Design a protein around this ligand. Sequence first.
Ligand SMILES: O=c1ccn([C@@H]2O[C@H](COP(=O)(O)OP(=O)(O)OP(=O)(O)O)[C@@H](O)[C@H]2O)c(=O)[nH]1
Length: 460
Amino acid sequence: PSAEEFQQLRKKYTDAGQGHVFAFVDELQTGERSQLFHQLSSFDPVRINELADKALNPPASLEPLPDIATASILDSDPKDLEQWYEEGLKLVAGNKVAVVLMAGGQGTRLGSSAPKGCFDIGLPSHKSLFQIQAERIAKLQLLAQRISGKEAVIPWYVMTSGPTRKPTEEFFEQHKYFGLNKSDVIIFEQGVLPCISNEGKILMESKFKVAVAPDGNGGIYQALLTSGVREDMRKRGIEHIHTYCVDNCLVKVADPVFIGFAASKQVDIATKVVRKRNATESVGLILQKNGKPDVVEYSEIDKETAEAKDPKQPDVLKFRAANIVNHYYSFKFFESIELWAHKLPHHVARKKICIPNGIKLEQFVFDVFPMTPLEKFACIEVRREDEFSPLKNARGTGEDDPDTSKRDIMSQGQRWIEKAGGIVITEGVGVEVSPLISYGGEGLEFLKGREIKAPAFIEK
Ligand SMILES: O=c1ccn([C@@H]2O[C@H](COP(=O)(O)OP(=O)(O)OP(=O)(O)O)[C@@H](O)[C@H]2O)c(=O)[nH]1
């Protein structure tokens, strides 16, 4: 940039109240000066003032979702569960199923230097979360091929962000895309936003770098349009989309039961929950808030509401639908994004950010739920120990960490083997079962009668 191009950009920022981002220009080495110029040209400071103004200058009725919107792997008719599986697999076979992996988050409490998906939780195989999830895609495709005779494809749209993008692209590349075909793995970006003070002033990471953060998991909807991903899905003939977080080590990627369940209710949005078993669990819950599908924080649930027993089922809680951020969307729903993408608010996330101190402005993925007709919303309860194991904290926390994650995968593996007639001997811990061997506990008949000495790794 010329001196006059630079000064034009300094004026735009100063006029917007944000001129302090050039405060250290005098001491910058031209290359650094060039970087700040380009980074600052990607943001409109007026738009940032808008979002910051709405964010900083802005008793519900709670009922569970209606019986007609809900199901349970635990309680539903196994006949339904099996029909849903069979039908969901058919949609996979038809190449109608896509996955969006939400992998743009910075993960600032596990505090890895790498993207969370690269994390090695300590399994015998030493596989990353990325690889495990990819092998589930691979395995499910081969399962679908059995019934159809034809190749099945589930496109894997990996949503990253600025801080996550490049190292994720390099990791997938080094790992030869985990045995999937390149064309079927699509890495894309959500937008980022500068982090702001309590007074809405842009925060500086360095003298020549603005502190940025991804704009929330809710930024997914806009990012589908911007990245060109929704229209890629159009070309591919996608009709059904499964979306989850990279941190879930137990994720049933493109779960046919979930797809088959959602498709048969002809809903636009479905969700997975696990069971809340004790009233004191600090878990966000899916329910109707003011006659509308929503996710409500645990703090907003009074003692009496949390404690209430289900009248139709007195041994379990009335409000028990613990949110695991695991969603289905119809393609029809994705074509409606323009009509409401602007109706999603940026929330104030007070985090520790530079040169809790700051704010990250974030959209919430579930904020579209109350905008969605109750008749277009579904929810299925699943088994935690088969489906939900978040990597959220560093080792030594005792909760949602590498060890709980490893435990969850390795005790699943053992249990799967034991159900198939396998004899697991632990003179020592569990057994790691490769998704390339078993997606969901099937195809282990060959282990009947065999002694496996734990800890162990069953691989192709
Ligand atoms: O791909 C994603 C995923 C999540 N997020 C956003 O991250 C916010 C933080 O919550 P997360 O649940 O994503 O935890 P994290 O791994 O980011 O860990 P921390 O940074 O909180 O220490 C969530 O509210 C979501 O909106 C994204 O921006 N992009």
